[PDB]
Amino acid sequence: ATLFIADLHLQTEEPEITAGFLRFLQGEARQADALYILGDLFEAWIGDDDPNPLHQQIASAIKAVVDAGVPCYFIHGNRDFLVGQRFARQSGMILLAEEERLDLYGREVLIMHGDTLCTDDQGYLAFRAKVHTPWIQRLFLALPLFIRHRIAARMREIMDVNPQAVVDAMERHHVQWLIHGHTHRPAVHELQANGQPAWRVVLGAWHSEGSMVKVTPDDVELIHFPF
Amino acid sequence: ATLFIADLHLQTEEPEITAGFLRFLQGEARQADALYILGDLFEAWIGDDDPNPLHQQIASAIKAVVDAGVPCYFIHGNRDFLVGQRFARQSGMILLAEEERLDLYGREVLIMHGDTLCTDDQGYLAFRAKVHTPWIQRLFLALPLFIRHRIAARMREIMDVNPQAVVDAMERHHVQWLIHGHTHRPAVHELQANGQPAWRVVLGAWHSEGSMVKVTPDDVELIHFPF
Ligand SMILES: CS(=O)(=O)Nc1cccc(C(=O)Nc2ccc(S(=O)(=O)N3CCN(c4cc(Cl)cc(Cl)c4)CC3)cc2)c1
Ligand SMILES: CS(=O)(=O)Nc1cccc(C(=O)Nc2ccc(S(=O)(=O)N3CCN(c4cc(Cl)cc(Cl)c4)CC3)cc2)c1
Ligand SMILES: [Mn+2]
């Protein structure tokens, strides 16, 4: 089984979610062939140099899973797009592109975070355009941490996918399977893409529950678990 | 694993749901310790004497599962409260009460259809009161089928659970686990009952997806599958 999670929004304020996640990595995840984290692992990220102890707890727990022979992958979300190569090294996680097309035991599956599909949010697409320009990233990161923190804190209902952008994405990739998070509305959806039945499996956020998508040679399941 | 499904709303108009259900009984269900169907197996029921061929296909598929050594149980829903002992015999399914308290591998779980929890629907509780009076049932059933059909067809958004009725029910049973359908909003909910954390796992309707709850010594999962 290949596992997909997303939208853990981990943070110091919510340590129950953290312990939930550690129990999942210590347990379920070990038996997996691979684990993909499709973004919003962290509620916020201001750079890999952040000393926040949570960052190292997590990277440590994930690394042990990779050290167990189970490869962990990451796609960025809107919350944690600044996660970088140093965090990758600490956690043993391989960073991936915003869209990937997997071959899962013969089945071709498109994964992303899901936020690029929410094209009816004009104004988020402004924000995203800008925070993805390298030189805006490099600028932000070369500030000193204490100012990054102040910029973050001073910055204080999720628009669902545009249906057409979903089709276009599954058609651009010629796939009948899509897995994403971001929208926080866990569900299996049916649609038409490439003139055939297609499915969009949506992961949920981790609050009271956790969730995952489990892909096998024969099946694709979306699973909710309580803690 | 003990499986719980509900809300298949099976009917001649939707044969894809039927084939989906047959594939589940032929496959997943065989490996189970037991299968509980928590109501709305059928979109409508006017009595066990109905010759509708779908009724016998289904009873046949279920019976093979029981004949495989996997006990199947049924709680009535609002749609199929007239399912009776003859259908039980044809299908090998044991009929159960509207609430049961199970011991699942040491864990005490309340199951019901879920409609009795929707107490803010004044007017459904009228309908239910009446159609559950024996002599109103016996009257209806002693009509001739052709008139039952006409009464049914002439009869042509689901109110969610009242939160307090949920607590009261879990408290009446002294349980920290509840499984039900009816509301068609699949989810895991956290709450307080008996002054402890409790969980309410809700099954979904079968349309594009199927769903089930899988209970093991260690875990309670809600699973969506596509067809
Ligand atoms: C579609 S939606 O997601 O529902 N709504 C929506 C709309 C607009 C923005 C967002 C959103 O994610 N905002 C957001 C807010 C804070 C954060 S953060 O992790 O605290 N952090 C990320 C890095 N930020 C940053 C700031 C600058 Cl100066 C330049 C660059 Cl490079 C990055 C500073 C703040 C990350 C993201 C969310
Ligand atoms: C809360 S809700 O479910 O969202 N809304 C709601 C409100 C009120 C009623 C219902 C509802 O389930 N109606 C309903 C309609 C039809 C059916 S049925 O299966 O076709 N069938 C059941 C048996 N019926 C019957 C009729 C009489 Cl004369 C006496 C008796 Cl003994 C039974 C005849 C009709 C079964 C149920 C649903
Ligand atoms: Mn998210």
Ligand SMILES: [Mn+2]
């Ligand atoms: Mn997101």
Ligand SMILES: [Mn+2]
């Ligand atoms: Mn129903």
Ligand SMILES: [Mn+2]
């Ligand atoms: Mn119902």
